[PDB]
Structure formats: structure tokens, C-alpha cells
């Protein structure tokens, strides 16, 4: 280690001491602080323009359910059904009649589509379409029954009248019926153009009223769906982008700064890998076998690859965010996960700046020496944790509601060891103290042996390992 | 210990070192890993075929309550009652009339039983049957009252009409009335034969509408019950078991592998007990009294007896699971507990493989040296815990709802020390700050002295014992 | 300490070694174990006979509210009111009319009182009585208003008809009205005489329908109350006490055993105080000042005074429990607290028997050396805890519901540091983000600075003191 | 340090030893104990007079909603809306008609205002006023739309009749409509003058029924507001202040004692700063550089500046509390925060008296040596905590309700790591397992990685730092 002392210790420096190392004037770190401001402001003024459009989306549907569903009070979304045969007729007819009488009874001023799509013939806007099997004769007590999947879409066409038909003539064939759907579309004008100060968006909803009968169980649920397909509406007017282009040319700063930091930080990655070739031979091997691909690991800094990671996502995110002016994408999920996961991972990079101080390094490196020991034991618990998830899903599965699928059992058990919704699950078992009294006595032994296992002997390790690691770092 | 060194140290080995011990090629452990795949897949494809039949069971009843109970909205299962005398007449008659008019008003296409059982004469399908005392004259203010239990079942017979009677003529004798029941049966065809791709099941429900009056309290609850008695329905058709026997001959692999592992693991149990006779005398006793029936305990390995235990349950479980093709059992509880408790106890056997590594052994043996000290102290707490359960059941028993039986008090207190449903129980006491103000002041002193006892001086031991044991294992 | 070695070490012995001390055959401890069986069985068969009578009490009232209150659905107990002036007339008249027509419309077979009490003239059973001021002329915009408390009870008398009056002629004088009450009584026969196998109880309810108007706020609540005054009903019949006196002469065993143990244990108290006079002078004082009234404290054993305490309560409790055959007391609170607090304090005496073993003594004496240090710090927290209770009661008092009285704030805060009903109280503040936006910003700073104080710096002491005490006891 | 030994050690004394220092008779500390009684009694008898007026305020509104809102049942405050066009007409007309018929149908005896304010012409009491745009022609499918904010207030005037008009003639112009408001006022007399024993307050409510349509979404919410403007009512009567001035001249004791303590405690502040000039030079500097502005910090006692702080707030608070007799302020927030924050901060001053004992000093100074290390690490967590708040607000923002604004996300996450409302947020995500199945899989990974981070590796530090600090203070 004679002549490589100066260059291999420059790589192990800190910008508190780089200032007095060779006089570097470290703006190569200060640009990373600009991301903390610019990406978050890119994020916050993306969220507020998106939130205000969601409340317009999720409140016209609440308007539509009080106009298109017969007897719908509030709250009962998923428990709204039709049980008789004439409850199903009055539900269908009331949904059509309000559509034919929309500008007289409803406020809000919608207007019809006069569409040209696939489940509509030309002129037609509303179409109620049955679905039933091709040929099928099911009959209990004479069990000569034929089932062949071949569904026929019998649509009934109706267009809205222009100025102030035979759909009432309708049979349904219930013993073969699959589902009855209703399709229509409605344009409108958003009228929140005042706090935007300029020309607003212009919507087109797409309603699907669904009379679904899959289970053939004598109970038909009733649903409603919308998709706000947004595009701009026709105008020859001007003066809109006096301030609007001051948002349209802000993401170009995000395009600049994250890319210019993607250039800068990777050059250090280019520097660190380049300086590996010299330490390998290094005296025409003297020690030789001491380099072992884990002593190679402390060359590439883990903070930089995290800063490279966000900048891949961030400039991929904001280039997708450009698709709000004229691009026909409604991909409000892919553009949203990329921006949030960047900001979730940009802000954790601040902890690096806290480790430059001699006090805060103790608490963070306490996590670093203990993150192995927790992640070892977290595998020891997850094996037992998957044991109770498969056992509780079969025994307590048929009789209850919370324990029906694995994605609920892994939630109803995991929310239970922290101490939440515990008495409610004990109270739901005691509708079975008469009905099948073995399953009750298993459920008392299942639940008590689980909640008194993870708090009293598993949670205590996670307190003991960190205490056991905090003694090592300071002595 | 001269000549027994090699054989008594082979028994204390590990399959990480058995490979270099004598060249054994340890497939005698790899067969145990096959259970992890086969039993779980035996479990998961048992659950999904069982779940889909439960949702058909628990949704035809929800259909039946909206057809057979007068004025039943959703949610109010247990608080649905009839209070006047004419609420009870209109509830009975509406339950019969919908039965006589089922194919005209209900969708789902049920059909009648035309039964031959015990609470039905021949031809009859529906039977409403009173229950009242033989002779009894209760009268307040003239208390010459006779009570002798001798109940008479007065049934009224009615059969459904074939093509498009005197039950309206009915008296009830309320001062002697016990309960009025209604029995009928309905066959149907499940029509979820598409994702099964073959001939579906064919059900027969059994409805019991119960007008129960036990307490004679001027309030009659109303109930409904079903039991889906399933059997196959008549067909001369074929092509069903092109893929269905590929489930019917999968459990035979579970029959093979768990049994072949029941043969293998017990041979080591046969080996361990056989090698006990030599260590007893062992030098025509030299030490003699040192063997003390607890130094005998570390011979039989505790992991093997757990692997024997599941294989008893597993091949007993899956042989009961064969009763789904043609066996008339509906025993969906006994066959379910055995399979789940096996899988709960098969998956914990994976922890043995984690103890072969030098890191994971530390965390597990920390539990093993601390499982005595916790189970000592768990007896010290349960004595005090049963103290508050008997004290709170008498004082707070009459005035409240959660504290009515011991099986609720042992739930309402145990869910309370973890911190769940705590404010709701404090809020329920304050309907008694005027009504009997001593019981209120006891309830503030009962609850505060209990929740501030188990968190602050009992939960702290369970954190202290594990920390106190983690120092011993690593130093 | 020459000649007092043998007698002063006999007093420091254990019954594990008293057997080999002088051959005592320790039945003077085994009688204390008899209490564990006898008092608990005295308790459990007191609770089950009491529980079954409460469900008859609290279900006839639920019957009465569905017969006597106009438009009462379930659940809405405390939010049932009458707002107009004709809602109050229809509520009163419907309550009288159902009383006049009770045997025709209600099941359950009640019967009238034909009473002779104070708010009833002779023959009369029902009495609706106004309450209003003597003389008062309140008038806004002409504020010459007189208020003098002198209330007049104007009752209207009505008796039930015998075989198949002017109360409809009624004015109420609302501007002076205080409350309108309705009183009647109803006898009945309990008919759960079958599982008792003998002659049942015979009740007399006392209904009070209350139209309370205290606040004069334009909103009158409506209430209902009962008191089941129980006594036996008339009979010349016999054969009741073939098994019933086998309960009536079981408490005499509780009278025996607790008293015979009250005699035995106090003789040791008589022995311990008697042996104090000798240690005082003890060598015509040698050390003298070393006895300091805290070294006197370890003479009288703390376990015995607890066993004396329960036996005072237990034989006082069960002698009050004798008042269920013929004594006219309804004191079901005083007799219940004494029995439960005994059993709560009898069962903690079992821990003494656990301290005879060398293992369990460590965990219990860990509590004993740490019970000072916790109770010191519990005073340090309660000072700060009363600080937030007075601060939160004034600021957040007017705007919310949970924070209205101190008895709720001491519950809503104490249930909050354990982690229960936390988000619901944060959600209730955000109806004030527009209404008085200073109180909102205080409420975010009030709640966050409190819940993040007691979990993160106060709960951690209670874990640290016990860990800090567990190291002292074992080293 | 020769001659300044006596004076610089008098400043480091305790009143347990000041009694034997120079014979001081320490009433200069006992006056501070008088505040504990006087301020709290000033607080409690302020709260009870304020609480009783709030329940009169918040129960006349509950009366008003059952009289002025068409079809308002209880509970549904924020979900009460009008969806058709004729639901809006029947809601307006029913609100006017009940106002015109108030003394005939309502109890409580209100009376009209006959007002003279700004949204009322002379004589008029009720005024329903539209709001709509000046000129605007919005039309979908012909998008020549004009929007200019210029709102016109078209009021309709109506006065109540004196002894036993054209507002029914009304159009609304819905396509331009903004909001319809209704204003009126009602005086009354509180009649809770009995427990006050003297002349009560005399109120004037101000009702605002709001038909708000901002979003133009086809859904109009309906609201109600009151402001109880209180002043005294006209009387020539006397005898009121026989006991009432015994409250009016109690706050003057609070004016005395807190001010006389503000004089006393600040003289010690005047003493401590005065004695700093001597320690600076102190030997014409010998050490010189050892004084470093943090060794200056232990001169001014931190307990006194807290006692100065409350006395600033307390005498500012109670001088604002004088504004309840005749001052027209309704500022019941500013006068309330000052009194509560004083009492919150007066009561923490009691801990100083606990530190005079040798036992309680250990627990408090354990907090003092650990309050740095917690507040260091609390910055390390809040950086990561703001990361998840920005990430969860965009991804889970559109699809759910709890995650809509940052002020809820900082509550829904912070209430979640303590273990409250955890399963309810997992259950709300599973309405999206079909709808946009990427956002579901992110939500399982978002929530699990957060709740299993702060309990298992962040909560454990807060237990480890206090344990790590409790070892330092006692060894
Ligand atoms: C000049 C010829 C003789 C050299 C003899 C002395 C060698 C000595 O002067 O050092 C090498 C020097 C420093 O530049 P390096 O990048 O090689 O080394 C580190 C830098 O201090 C920072 O990077 P930079 O500011 O350059 O972007 C950064 O703080 C670190 O990484 P990090 O903290 O993780 O970000 C490292 O990367 O390189 C060249 O001579 C630069 C030449 C000047 C720039 C020319 C163009 C304007
Ligand atoms: C006999 C004359 C010479 C005495 C010389 C030896 C003295 C030595 O033999 O000891 C004193 C002896 C023991 O009786 P004591 O009661 O004085 O001393 C303890 C007893 O062992 C237990 O009480 P006991 O069984 O009596 O109810 C009890 O275990 C302890 O208290 P505790 O564990 O807290 O419950 C102590 O109280 O007293 C008398 O001589 C008893 C005489 C025999 C009974 C006569 C009537 C049947
Ligand atoms: C007298 C001339 C020769 C002096 C030589 C001895 C000097 C020695 O006697 O000491 C100085 C003495 C004590 O008074 P000081 O205030 O200077 O010093 C402390 C006092 O013991 C308390 O304050 P006090 O009771 O006065 O309000 C208080 O306990 C402390 O502060 P704290 O505990 O934080 O509250 C300190 O402030 O001052 C003057 O001589 C007082 C003169 C008598 C009062 C005259 C008017 C009635």
C-alpha cells in the first residue's frame, strides 16, 4: 500500500472535509438538493390538479345512482339487489324512463351522445341487451339438462327524442338469463373554470348499469360504473396560456436537473468501477485471496445507485406526465406510481446528509448493523405466519366473512397482532356456539394461541435485537 | 466412554456433515420436503372447491329471507321480532303464501320436494306446527297456576298445487304457546358447471322458519335455517372424468408420501429407543445415578415426533376427504380441522432446516431457553386474570352487554389489554352515571386498575425476560 | 441474639419445611384452599340464577318500547324525540290507547295493577300528570318576565275497563311546561319454571314514560324505565324445596369455612403482635435505635391481612345474599360488589403458594422490588396527565362530543395512549377546518404532542424500570 | 474562585436547605402554590358556565333541522342532498312555510326579529336570494360558451304575519345557478335561570340554510348554520348580584396573585443576569476562553421562565374573560386557548417540587439526558415519514376516501403505526382487486412495508435509547 495512499483515500472522503481537501467548491452535491425542491413541487402541483378532477368524477356517479337505480338510499352500494321477478322489471324500466326524461327532472344539464360506437347502432344512444344461453333445459326432478356455452346478445335500441318505443314489450327468459346490461354516454361541461381562470375541460361519461346473475342463486346484484373519457372541447377563443405554459415549461426543469444529475452521479460510478482494476493485482498478488467479492462490495457507494434509480423513474415519470394536454391516454396509474416512488426514494436520500454529523451516525449505523439480524428472524416468523394463514382459511372459512380468501386472512391476522379489530373477530365467532360447537372450540384455541404468541414471544425479539445491537455500536 | 464413541456420535450429526460423514446421499431428508409441496397443494385445491360451494349456500338463504320474512331489510338478523298479536299472524301467512306462489314471483327456478320424511305426511311439502302445553292455566292476580311439561305437535298439512286450504282457519292459543315452526324442502340445480367444465352438483335445501317463544317475555324472535344436503342428480351422460380423476388420484400421492415418511421417520424412533439399553448399564454402572430420566430425554428427537404427529393426522385427513364423491357424509368440520392442523404443523417443521445454519440457531435457541421462563410467569398472570373475570362478571353483568357470560368477559378483557375496543367499553358505562351511581364508580376503578396493570407491569416482564435471555445465549 | 434463636426462626418458616420442622401436619394451610372451591362455587351458582332474571327484565322493556312509543325503531334509544306540537299529542295518546287495549293486541299476557299507591287514586292504574310553573309570563321582545319555582302536579286519572274517559280533552300549556310523566304497573308470571323444576317468581313491573323538557330548547326527549319489584305469588302447593334447600344450606358452609378461617388466621396475627414486645428491649437495649418502625414492619405478614380482609367481606357478602327468599330488598348492587371483590382478592392469594418454589419467587419479587419505582414515576406522569385533561376540556369542549365532561376526557385520552379510537378523534376535528380555523390548528398540535409523548418517552420508562430491576434481583 | 464562593453557592441552593441556610422563611415559593388552586378554580368555574350554554346552542339547531329541512332524519348531516329539480323546489318551499307557521306547530316559543340589517329590507325577516352569473351560455355539443364572473343577488322579501306573498311564483335558472341561501333570525329566552338562581341570558339565533351548488355536478348539498349572538334583555328588576359579584370579583384575585408572582419571579431573573457580569472577567481573565455561551446557559433557571410565561398568558387570559358581562365580543376561542395553555403549563411546574427529593430526581433527569437523543432521532424518522405521506397521497389518492388530503394522510398513517384503524384501511383497498389491479398490488406493498417498519425497527429505538440512558444515570 505504498503509492496508492493518496488516491484511494480521496475516494473515502466527506464534503465537510473535501472543502479542505483540495479546494473543490462542492456544487457537485448541491445540485442533488435542488431535486428536493423541484421534484416535490412537480409532485404537489400535479396532485392538486388531479384531486379536483377526481371529486368531479366521483360525485357525478353519486348523482347518477340517485337517478337511475330504483330505491337506492345512501351507503348500501354492494348490498343492493333485486329478489323477485317484478323487482327486476321495475328496476329496468325506471332506468330507461329517467334517461328519456333527463332534461326535465335532473339538474346539472347533461346532453346525449348520439353515438357511433360498437354496442350502438347509428342514432341510438341507449341499449339494453340481454345475455342468455343458446339452448338449455334445466329442470329439477327431471334431470335431463343441457348446458353449452353460446351466448347471444339481444339488444334493444332506443334513441333520445329530439323535441317535446317497443322496449316495454320485453320478456327476459329468467331460467336461462346471464346478465342484463345498459349502456349510454353523456357529455357535459365542467364549470370550475374560475380558480383555473381559463377554459375548462369537457367530459364524456360512460355509464354501465349491470344486472349481473352469475351464481344463479335467486339474487341479482345491481351495479353502476363510469369512465370519464376527457378531451378538449371546441373553441376559437384565445388567452388561455398566459399562465398555463408556466406549468407546461416547468417539467422541463425537472427534465434538466434530474438528467444533469443522472450525468453527474454516474460518472462517479464510472470512477469507482475504473478504480477496481488496480486493487486486484495491486502488488502482483501479495495477499491475493483476501479480495473475496464481498470486500469488493464497499467500492460502489449504495447512496449513488439509489440516486440513479430515482432519476430513471423521475424523467420516465414526468415524460409520461406530459400526456395531459392532448394525448388520449387515461393512464393515471402508471404515471402516478413512478412519480410517488421517486419522491418516496428521493426523500430518503436526505439521511445521507445526516450521517455527516458525528451524532446522527450512531443511530443510523445502529439500524445498519441490525438490519441483518432482523431480516434473518423475519424469515423465521413468516414460516409460522404462513402456517396459521393456511390453517385458518379452511377451518374458519365457511362460517365467517373476514376469513374467506387468503388476501383477507393475511390482513385479518396481521392487523390482529398489532391490536386492531380483535374483539370484533371474537364476537363474530359466537354466532356459532350452538351451530357446530366443535368449530367454536377450535376458534377459541386458534385465536388465543396466535395473538398470545406474536406479542409475547415474537415482538419481544424485535425489541431485544435492537437493544442487543445498540450496546455493540457504542462499546 | 471408550468403544461407544463412534456410534453415539453418529446419532448426534447433521445432514450438512452426514454427506461427509460416511457418504449417505441424504434422500432420507429430501422426502420430507416433498410434503411441503404435496400437502399444501392438497390443501389449496381442497379449499377452492369448498369455498365456491359455500357462497352458493350462504346466498340462497339471503335470497330466502327476502322472500319468506315479512318486512326484513338487510343487516337486522338477530333483532328481527314480532311484538303484537297480529304481527305474528301476518308473518305466518306471508310465509305460506310466497311458498304457494314461488314459480310466479321468484327467479332462480326452485322446485318442490313432494317429500316422504317424518314431519310431513305423504304428498305434503309444507307443514306449520304449533307447540303448546298439555294443560296449563296461568293467571296473574288469581295465582292458581298449573305447569306440566307435555307438549303436543299440532301440524297443519299443505302440499303445493300442480297446475295453474284451511290453513287460514287457524288459532294459536298464545298464553300456552311455545314455538311455531315451518318446514319445507327445495331442490335446485347449481349452474356453475362452466369453470368446472363438467356436470354440476344438485342441491336440496331444508328451510326451518322458527317463531321461537321460550322466555314468554312478550317478544318473539324470527329465524331461518338451511342445510344443503348434496347428492348427485340423475344422468346417463358421460365424459366427466377426463380431468376429474386427475384430482381423484392425487390424494393417493398424499396417501403414498406421508405413509412412506411415516415408515421412514419412525425407524429412527425405533433406532433411538433401541440405543437406550446400552447407555443404562454402560460400564456395569460406573456413575449409575447420573441417568435421571431427564438426561434420558435428549435421545428421542422432538422434531421427529412432530413429523409422526402430522402424518397420523394427514393420512387420516385425506382418507376422510375421499368422502366427497359418493359418501353421504356432510362432515365438513372433522375433515377440515385435521387437514389444517397438519399444515399448521407441517410448516413449522421447516424451522429445523433453519437451525442447521450457524446464524439462525441463535434466535431459535433464544426462544428455547426462554420458553420455560415465560410459561412459568404465564401461570402467575392467569391466576390474577381469572380474578378479574369472575369479579367483572357479577358486578358489571346485569347492566351491560359485553360482560354477560364468561366466554365474552374472557374476550372483552383480553382484547382490552392489547388496546382494542377500549373507549367503547368506557362509553357504555356512562349510561349509568345517574342509574345506580355506585356501580359506575366501581366500573371506573375496575377498568383503570386493570388496563394500567397488564400493560405497565406485566407486559414489561415479557420484554424483560427475552432481553434477559438474549444476553445469556450470546455470552 | 442468644436464646431467641429457635422461636424467632420458627416464625420465619415455610410449610414445605414445617413438615420437617416439628411435625405439624399442616392442615392450618389446607383449609385456606377450601375457600378456593367453596367461594367460587358460591359465586358461580349465584351468577347464573341472577343472569337469567336479568334477561327477563331487559327484554320486557324492549317489548314495552315497541308497544308504548309511537314510531320507535330499534337502536335509537337516546335520539328519540318529539319536535312539533302535534308529535307530542300523538305520542301521548298512542301511549294511553295501547294501555287500554293491552290484552287484545299484545302477546305475553300481562294484567293490570288496580293499585293503591301515592300517584294513583283508588281504582286508578294509569295517570298522566303535567308539571308546569305556578305563574310565569315569558315573552321575547317584551321582556317583562316572571319566574318563580312552584310546580303543580295536574294528574288525569284513568282505570282499565273490566269487560268488553275525558283524557282526550286535554291542553298542555307548552310555554310553561316542565315534563309530562305516565305511571302504571303490570304484574306477570315468569314461565321459566322448567329448568328450575319448581314454582317460579312472580313479577310486577313499574313503567315510567317520561316526556322531559328541561332545557326548553324546542326538543323533548322521550324515555322509558322499569323496576322489577319481585315477590312470591300465592299458592297452597308443596314439593318445592326437595332440591332448593340444597342451595339454601350451602352458604352456611361458606358461613362456616370463612369464619373458621377468620378464627385461625387472626390467631397468627395475635401471635405476631405478641412477639413484638420481646424484640423491643431484647438485651435492655443494646442497639436500641435500630428498631425504627420500618424494621417493625416485617413482623405482621401481608398475606394474612389480605386473607382477613376477604373473610370480612365474604361472610358480610353471603349474609346479604340470604336476602333472596323473603326479604324485600332489591339491593342487587351491594351484595354483588362484596362477593366479587372477595373473589378478586381470594384468587390473588394463590400467588403465595407459588412463592414457595425457588423458580417462581424470582418473578414475583421482581415485581416487589419494582412496585416502588413504578409508583414513584406514576405520580410524575399523572401530574402531566391532569394538565392535558384540563387544557383539552376547555379548548375542544364546545366543538365536539367526546371532550365534553372530565369523566370522558380522562377516558378519551387514556384510551388514546394505548392506541384505540385514535383516527376517529382526528376525523372529528376536521369538520372545523373552515369553522374557526384556529381551534383546528390547536387540535393538531394538542393531539400530536400528547400521543407522541406518552408512547415514546413515558411508556419506555415502564419497560426500562422493570428491565433495570430484573438485573438487580438475579445479580 | 476565592471570594465568590459564598454568593455563587447561595444561587445554587434548594428551599429544603434555604431554611437552614440563612433563615429565609420561604414564602417566596409558597405563593407559587397558590396559583395551583386559584387558576384551576378560575378554570373550572369558567368551564361549567360555558358548557351549559353550548348544549343550549347545539340543541336548538338539532331542533331547527327537524323543522326546516324536508325529510331530514338523524345522523345524515353531510350526506343530505337534493338530486332532482323538484326535490329542490319542495325543499325551498317547506323551509318557508314552516317559518310562516312557527308559533302554531313548534314548541319552544321563538319569536321573529323584525330586523334592520343588510340582507333584509325594513320589515322583512326572511329573504331567499338566488345567485347566478351575469351572462353565460353553456351548451355541450355546441361549445360556444361564455363564462364571466359577475354574480347578481336576487332576493325575495317576506315578513312574518302579525295576526291570524308572491314567493311561490319563482323560477331558478338552474344552468346558471350558483347557490340559494335563506336568512332569518329568532330571539328567545333561556329558561335555565333556576340553578343560576337569577335573571337568565336572552339569545338571538341567526339561521343560514344553504343550497350550495359549486361543483355543478348534479348534486346540491343542503346545510344549516347558527350563531348565538348573546346580549342581556330588558328589565327594571334587581337582586341579581347578591352572589354573582362573588364571581365577578374572584378573577381580581387571579389578577393579584399571578401579577404579584410576575413581580417576584422576575426579580430573580433580574438577579441572575446581574450576577453574570462578575463571572466573565472574574480574575482579569485567567481561563477566559472557557466561558463559551453554553456554560453561560446554566445561570438563568428554566423553571422561572416557564413561570413567567404562564403569568403573561394568565393575566392576559382572565382580562379577556371579563368580556362576558357587557362586552359584545363572542371571542370564545382566544380567551379559551390562553387559559388552558396556562393551566397545561402551570401544572407541569409541580415537577420542580418533585425534583427536590432524592428519589424522584433520578426519573426526571433520565428524561433530561435522553430528550436530546430522542429529538435527534425524531428528525431521522420524520424525513422518512414525509416520504410515505407524499407517495401515498398520489397513488392511493383518487381511489379512496381516507387518503384524499395531506392533513388526512398524516393522520391516517400516524394513527396506523400505533395500531388503530388498520383492518378498515386494508378492507377498503379490496374494492379494487378487479378495478385497476396494479394499484391494489401497490397498496399491499405500500401498507405492509410501512406498518412493519415503524413498529419493528423504529419503535424499538425509542425503547432502546431510554434503556441506554437509564444505565448512564445510575452508574
Ligand atoms: C488536474 C491534473 C492533475 C490532477 C492531480 C490531482 C488530482 C486530484 O485533484 O483529484 C482528481 C480530480 C478531482 O476530481 P475527481 O472527480 O476525479 O475526484 C473527486 C472530486 O473531488 C469530485 O468530483 P468532481 O468535482 O470532479 O465532479 C467528487 O467530490 C468526488 O466524488 P463524489 O464525492 O462521490 O461526488 C470525486 O469524484 O480530478 C481531476 O484532476 C479534475 C481536474 C479539474 C477539472 C478539469 C475540468 C474543469
Ligand atoms: C407444647 C408445650 C411445649 C412447646 C414447646 C415447643 C413449641 C413449638 O412446638 O412451637 C409452638 C407450638 C406450635 O404452634 P404455634 O401456633 O405456636 O406455632 C406455629 C405452628 O406451627 C402453626 O400454628 P398451629 O398449627 O398451632 O395452628 C403455624 O404453622 C404457624 O403459623 P402460620 O404458618 O403462619 O400459620 C405458627 O403459629 O405451639 C404450641 O406448643 C402448640 C401445642 C400443641 C397444640 C395443643 C392443642 C392441640
Ligand atoms: C442585608 C444586608 C447584608 C446582606 C448580607 C447577607 C446576604 C444574604 O442574606 O443573601 C442576600 C439577601 C437574600 O435575598 P436574595 O433575594 O438576594 O437571595 C435569595 C433569597 O434567599 C430569596 O429571595 P428573597 O427571599 O429575598 O425574595 C430566594 O430564595 C433566592 O432566589 P429563588 O430561590 O430563586 O427564589 C435568592 O434570590 O438579599 C438581601 O440581603 C436581603 C435583605 C433582607 C430584605 C430586606 C427587605 C425586607
Residue numbers in the entry:
A (entry chain D), B (entry chain A), C (entry chain B), D (entry chain C): 38 to 201, 216 to 526
Please give me the paper's original passages concerning this structure.
TRPML1 regulates lysosomal calcium signaling, lipid trafficking, and autophagy-related processes. Loss-of-function TRPML1 mutants cause a neurodegenerative disorder, Mucolipidosis type IV (MLIV). TRPML1 forms a classic tetramer: each subunit contains six transmembrane helices (S1–S6), two pore helices (PH1 and PH2) and a ~30 kD lumenal/extracellular domain. The extensions of S1–S3 (labeled as IS1–IS3), including several basic amino acids, present an unique feature that presumably binds to PtdIns(3,5)P2 in the membrane.
